[PDB]
């Protein structure tokens, strides 16, 4: 007691320092592991990619949402989206089962979010920017786009759809 405890204390607090550190890397391990397989994709656009939210709606591929789905390789598909005040463009996003999708998403106003019920598509959509994630779907059906980012008052009424056709 009063110094007997101390030698021990310190050294236990080594056990920890060490053990902590291990787990920790084991994490850093796994995190990193995911970086090497596909599921890495849902990670945004490293690289910058500027536009502006005024002209965006009027022209660019975000002008005409007819042209949002757009085949870019025997299985790749750039899908222009416009997240924006209190819907997403288009509704819905027709897309094929078991093929690579490549979302391109920007805003014409404040920052919204773009989070796809059933996935790791989940990404902040900034006015003035093109956020670029890749997912590849896997099961036919519907997928709600929630926007988990205070776009303002229609906020909690800012959902969307993506159908993944058969």
């Amino acid at each position: 007691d009063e110094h007997k405890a101390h030698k021990a204390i310190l050294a236990y607090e080594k056990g920890w320092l060490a053990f902590s550190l291990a787990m920790l890397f084991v994490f850093i391990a796994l995190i990193a592991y995911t970086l090497a397989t596909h599921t890495a994709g849902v990670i945004p656009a490293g690289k910058l990619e500027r536009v502006d939210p005024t002209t965006v709606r009027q022209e660019g591929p975000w002008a005409d949402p007819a042209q949002a789905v757009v085949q870019t390789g025997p299985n790749q598909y750039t899908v222009y989206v416009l997240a924006f005040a209190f819907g997403y463009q288009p509704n819905p996003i027709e897309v094929p089962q078991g093929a690579e999708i490549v979302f391109k998403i920007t805003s014409p106003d404040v920052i919204h979010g773009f989070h796809v019920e059933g996935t790791n598509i989940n990404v902040e959509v900034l006015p003035g920017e093109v956020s670029t994630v890749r997912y590849t779907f896997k099961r036919p059906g519907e997928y709600r786009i929630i926007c988990n980012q205070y776009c303002g008052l229609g906020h909690q009424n800012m959902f969307g759809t993506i159908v993944v056709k058969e």
Binding site: K4, Y12, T39, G118, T119, N120
Partner: protein, 33 residues
Amino acid sequence: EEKPKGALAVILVLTLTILVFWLGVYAVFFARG
């Protein structure tokens, strides 16, 4: 006097959570990927 079970049962429980929690998620990150 001697070996402090308390702290340990603790940094354990802690440890155990951080496990229940981090694998827990991983798994999900996955189910979604």
